[PDB]
Design a protein around this nucleic acid. Structure first.
Lengths: 71, 116, 177
RNA sequence: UGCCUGGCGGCCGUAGCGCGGUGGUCCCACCUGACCCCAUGCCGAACUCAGAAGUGAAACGCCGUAGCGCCGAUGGUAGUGUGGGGUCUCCCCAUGCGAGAGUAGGGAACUGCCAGGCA
RNA sequence: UCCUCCUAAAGAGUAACGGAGGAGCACGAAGGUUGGCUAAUCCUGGUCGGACAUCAGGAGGUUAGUGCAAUGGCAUAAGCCAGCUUGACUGCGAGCGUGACGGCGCGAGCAGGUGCGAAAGCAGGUCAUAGUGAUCCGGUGGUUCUGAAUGGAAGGGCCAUCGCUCAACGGAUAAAAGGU
RNA sequence: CCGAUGCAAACUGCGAAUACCGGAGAAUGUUAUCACGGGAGACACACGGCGGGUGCUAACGUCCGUC
């Protein structure tokens, strides 16, 4: 005895995010990609096709999943 | 821990095929009987299922579980798929090894003219 | 195979008569025997460990695998991954033959043969014991002895209590304590 | 159409943890030997070849045990947006939204499709 | 110059030489893919080993680890044995998240050709968050693209690109350094 | 160190109000919304209320987010 990075959710549930849009950019893996959602090298979730976003809880561990469904 | 490990290992392909959302052919192997099922992408319905136990195909088979039975099941699955219009389903090994009866069944199914 | 039939004929029958069981295989069965060396004196020299592994392979029907260290502590002056010893697993005809030959020739001829220590149990049925002077085993000759080394023989036991293990040991009359 | 067994999905502790009983009709389970397809970072450990010759040991389906664990109310409590007041560091007033835990209650799950045995 | 949690009032952002250090490296294997495996921690048995130099029966299931100081998520391990390779290749690339710009990051998908497989499919470096170089200057190879009449040559214009601790790291004119 | 009672900025098996993103909706608001072009103007703000940091949780001291 710097420049802060921009975190948080950019598009929330109900947004008509089109293909290529990134849903959230988090440090680690806060949420896991579900249907029609891809995960990048830097632990970033992005959409693969047009649709409405949704967040769901499933699995023995009760893990949060980000999914996209047809509008 | 054998069945749990088998399920865990099969879960890899089980989830992998989900993203592409294509009909899947799964095989359950047991010395007593062999089962083959065609499952739709939604995963809650089966297009067609065959079992070595059924007499319809066990009449000509000396024993329910063997290479000949696997080949017969493969042929039956292939012809049913051809007459139903599966449109080139994918397949999963269900965590088994593709060297014995699984390979024989796959070859028998492909012999009909499938493109999986 | 060779001894399994006799075991079923005699030991299983005796245990069933003694304990009034129902299932034919209610009596616990031995699955595998693990031969290990607890010498722990091959740190300085690797040729000692190599010769010990060769002796293990010669006595057994299969060669051993070298095992590395698990944790590193400054108290005992040990690093991580340091090869010290090896183990052999026997399950099947080889295991039956090895057990038969042992109980036939090796066990009777032991110096200070005060009997097996039944108290040396894991608390659930598995029995592990070690003895010195591998020269007792006929598979090793006096002309090819480098040093005195101990053994560690552990038998698999599926029982849920020590009474079953004691009965299994008494199956061969358990000469004495 | 009813009982039992195996597989494919949803539900993910109202599905779990501990205890007693039952399951060989069918199904499932222990695999003996492997010089033969397959191989061990040693081991036929797993996988592959022949079933009732040996049985339900362990695993798993079901009933009860509400013992542990979970959810779960109405109500209250702590807090806060808005305007005002006081002894203004903090609190109160009219109004809206409303904690956690626990109590009543529940459950030893349920549900959709396919294969087999007994009816 | 850049990262790591708070103060920072549950989107982002939001202070004072604020509280805190680390990186300016490294792996051309620590990269890709197929099979299987996956604890740590503690009790009990071994010649000593008692837990602590190795082995097997249990308590318990992600408390060990993930190249780094630290950080989040990670048992479908994002680890760890057996095998083969270089997809860390080339032209690219709709769109999205940031910005004042210079620009930065992710990114579905096509084509030319490859590795992992029987296939489904993965491979545009490393689990990630820092780990570097912009303008100008000097050097290499291609282009008749251009060439002050003609045919060349010299010199420029663009393509991959080394040096430039340029480590004053957006880098102020050609102006050498230390002090009472 | 074994179990428990209370506590926390680099503590959450739980979890507000409040803020913010999208969809639908009766009504008001001189389109008050967004796109392009011309013209500018300003680039030491002060104080107060609300919740904090700093300060010796002494200071009509200091800096923040909102009105």
């Amino acid at each position: 005895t710097s420049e802060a990075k921009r975190l948080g959710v950019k598009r929330f549930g109900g947004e008509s995010v089109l293909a290529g849009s990134i849903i959230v950019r988090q440090r680690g893996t806060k949420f896991h990609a579900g249907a029609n959602v891809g995960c990048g090298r830097d632990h970033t979730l992005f959409a693969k096709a047009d649709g409405k976003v949704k967040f769901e809880v499933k699995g023995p561990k009760n893990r949060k999943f980000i999914s996209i469904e047809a509008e | 821990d054998k069945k749990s490990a088998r399920i865990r290992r099969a879960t890899r392909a089980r989830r992998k095929l989900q993203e592409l959302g294509a009909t899947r052919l799964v095989v359950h192997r047991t010395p007593r009987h062999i089962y083959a099922q065609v499952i739709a992408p939604n995963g809650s319905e089966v297009l067609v299922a065959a079992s070595t136990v059924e007499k319809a195909i066990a009449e000509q088979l000396k024993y329910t579980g063997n290479k000949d039975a696997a080949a017969a099941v493969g042929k039956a699955v292939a012809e049913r798929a051809l007459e139903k219009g599966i449109k080139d389903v994918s397949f999963d090994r269900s965590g088994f090894q593709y060297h014995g009866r699984v390979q024989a069944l796959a070859d028998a199914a492909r012999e009909a003219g499938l493109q999986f | 195979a060779k001894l399994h039939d006799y075991y079923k004929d005699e030991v299983v029958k005796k245990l069933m008569t003694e304990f009034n069981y129902n299932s034919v295989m209610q009596v616990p069965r031995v699955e595998k025997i693990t031969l290990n060396m607890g010498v722990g004196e091959a740190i300085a020299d690797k040729k000692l460990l190599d010769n010990a592994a060769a002796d293990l392979a010669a006595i057994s029907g299969q060669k051993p695998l070298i095992t590395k260290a698990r944790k590193s502590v400054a108290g005992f002056k040990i690093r991580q991954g340091y090869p010290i010893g090896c183990k052999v697993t026997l399950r099947g005809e080889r295991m039956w033959e090895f057990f038969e030959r042992l109980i036939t020739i090796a066990v009777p001829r032991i110096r200070d043969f005060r009997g097996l220590s039944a108290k040396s149990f894991d608390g659930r049925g598995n029995y592990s014991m070690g003895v010195r002077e591998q020269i007792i085993f006929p598979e090793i000759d006096y002309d090819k002895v480098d040093r005195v080394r101990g053994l560690d023989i552990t038998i698999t036991t599926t029982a849920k209590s020590d009474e079953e293990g004691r009965a299994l040991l008494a199956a061969f009359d358990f000469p004495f304590r």
